Design a protein around this ligand. Structure first.
Ligand SMILES: CC(=O)Nc1ccc(Oc2ncccn2)cc1
Ligand SMILES: CC(=O)Nc1ccc(Oc2ncccn2)cc1
Lengths: 304, 304
């Protein structure tokens, strides 16, 4: 029993982290097979960042201007290309620790672990969600760029995120491992205002299930609701609309607990309208939205 | 910027996790050098657990009754002893992945990462504190016993916890790696009521510092207080007494932010007396007490 914000074990990703230096910029790269992936803004000064022309900056760089260090051993760069907002550095050595891996582009509301790194050295791991405005609320200092977000399915690491930017509001923007930004963000130091940070309704319901399963039941009420009725209250509270797909996804938690999804919706409706009245749910004073239904089932069943 | 509940990278501990089976009980062991550490209740049936005589149960066991599996390779057990509440199984092979390590007994209020495991396979990592009543609020299902808590200093893993028990109230009890329980708890399935779960005041102040450093400043007030005055309010709110040692420990955060410790105490005093009024601090609706001053300095400076 007990329910924790749990990251995936980080070991398989720790074995992929390298330091990339281009002139006076150092940040992190991901070494998979004989390729190192890193933010293309490694080639930028902080002055470059105000209005970089990446293609033009890049022409001045040779393979030997990219210094790749894995632990305290330098890798030899034998090729470099730009793919969208990532650089791919071909090195002469396949990472001996390459795990089985996929590159996946996640949808907003999906959760992932981040291995926060500096000079290619891991400092910590934490669990995130891709917010509905395609930001993440990370912990990222200068030198953390190239830190990656991932899920693990048994032995297969699915890489979903690479850290590129802190927006002036202190939230985080980044790309998939094809170098495409999540949302409308760009690797330029300019005004970039995120949209509404809505609450991931389906994740909140999952976490209310997780709570019931762990003995926190005070918020269970006598009411039900309908998707359309619930969704009027969701709109009012900057909660994502709930779809029949979300209902279906919560089906197994519904089954395990014997609480119909729409009953738990009515419970959430009362929490939104009445607040917590100084009470907590799984040790939180607010409604947690960074557990997916899959996360709740994994953690509550004990998947390794 | 941003501030996250961050675990240590788990890789060095993942390389130490094995499965220990004694008859029909399977749980996790820690393989360091040629020794595997595990809860001594591996030798118990769930019936044994109601009133186990460990010495008497243990006499019936031979080296070959202990099945140690590292990945899908069996280790050969050449010795077993009981030390307090842990079994030490001598195996004929030194773990090739043994990191530099220490066994340390932490004090209440100190934080650590847990690698939650099942059948010797890691499922996740999360950050904890030893509560002032010597419990932890973990996430631990059946088969999770032998899962360990640790800090890392650069390359040296300090092991501080091994998971033994879920108390009837759903909180967690365990030992150091010498097999001594934190607090008054015992490896027996019986009424064991934890004391008052007080809030780790020094950790809350550290986290208010972390917040100020990350731009959450709304709770900064015009008041100061004294240790004795603050401590009257702490008592009332089941907060640990603040000592001059805690003040000293917060000194560097004080220096970095230019907010005297007693001013931040007066800020906390107002939060305790007035509550949050529906506001948040680093995305929490309650005062977080599972960051140490060391944790705040590490995460805010970027230590790897
Ligand atoms: C686009 C730019 O500004 N400079 C650049 C041009 C061609 C390049 O050649 C290349 N090499 C290996 C694989 C793929 N591509 C690399 C970098
Ligand atoms: C205490 C008990 O009930 N049974 C037991 C007795 C002596 C033991 O010998 C031993 N062997 C190696 C190192 C240290 N000790 C082991 C287990």
């Amino acid at each position: 029993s007990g329910f924790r914000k749990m990251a995936f074990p980080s070991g398989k990703v720790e074995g992929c982290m390298v330091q990339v230096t281009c002139g006076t910029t150092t940040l992190n790269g991901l070494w998979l097979d004989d390729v190192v992936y890193c933010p293309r803004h490694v080639i930028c000064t902080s002055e470059d960042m105000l209005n970089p022309n990446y293609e033009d900056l890049l022409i001045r760089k040779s393979n030997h201007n990219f210094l790749v260090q894995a632990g305290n051993v330098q890798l030899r760069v034998i090729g470099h290309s730009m793919q969208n907002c990532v650089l791919k550095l071909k090195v002469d050595t396949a990472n001996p620790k390459t795990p089985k891996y996929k590159f996946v582009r996640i949808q907003p509301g999906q959760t992932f672990s981040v291995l926060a790194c500096y000079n290619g050295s891991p400092s910590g791991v934490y669990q995130c969600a891709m917010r509905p405005n395609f930001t993440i609320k990370g912990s990222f200092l200068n030198g953390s760029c190239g830190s990656v977000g991932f899920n693990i399915d048994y032995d297969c690491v699915s890489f979903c995120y690479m850290h590129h930017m802190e927006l002036p509001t202190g939230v985080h923007a980044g790309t998939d491992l094809e170098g495409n930004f999540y949302g409308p963000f760009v690797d330029r130091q300019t005004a970039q205002a995120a949209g509404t940070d809505t609450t991931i309704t389906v994740n909140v319901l999952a976490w209310l299930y997780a709570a019931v399963i762990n003995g926190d039941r005070w918020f269970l009420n006598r009411f039900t609701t309908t998707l359309n009725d619930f969704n009027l209250v969701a709109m009012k509270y900057n909660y994502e609309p709930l779809t029949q797909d979300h209902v279906d996804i919560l089906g197994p938690l519904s089954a395990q607990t014997g609480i119909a999804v729409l009953d738990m919706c009515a419970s959430l409706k009362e929490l939104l309208q009445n607040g917590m009245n100084g009470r907590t749910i799984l040790g939180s004073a607010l409604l947690e939205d960074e557990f997916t239904p899959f996360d709740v089932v994994r953690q509550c069943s004990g998947v390794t």
